[PDB]
Design a binder for this molecule. Sequence first.
Ligand SMILES: *[C@@H]1O[C@H](CO)[C@@H](O)[C@H](O)[C@H]1NC(C)=O
Lengths: 48, 48
Amino acid sequence: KNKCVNFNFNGLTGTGVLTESNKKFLPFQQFGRDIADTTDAVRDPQTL
Amino acid sequence: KNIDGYFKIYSKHTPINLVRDLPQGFSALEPLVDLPIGINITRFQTLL
Ligand SMILES: *[C@@H]1O[C@H](CO)[C@@H](O)[C@H](O)[C@H]1NC(C)=O
């Protein structure tokens, strides 16, 4: 965390700085999106 | 709803104080399950 890394979540590849989020995902929800249809928040497939 | 043979269920439970009909208000239904049955369904029935 807190480092710019090449992250790969279930094929959702990208590059960013993964940090602690204060969003409230619903249990079914898997990942978020930005207005530009780019991922903004994800759920770790190993640790929910 | 059955889209491409995938049975999606969205469910929600809210309290009311009424005996007449569907109350005025707004509430959304969180998705519950996906059943990959692949069945064409055209008629149904509820069970009391
Ligand atoms: C496996 O994944 C589950 C998913 O929540 C997690 O609880 C568990 O700690 C994981 N175990 C290992 C050994 O990765």
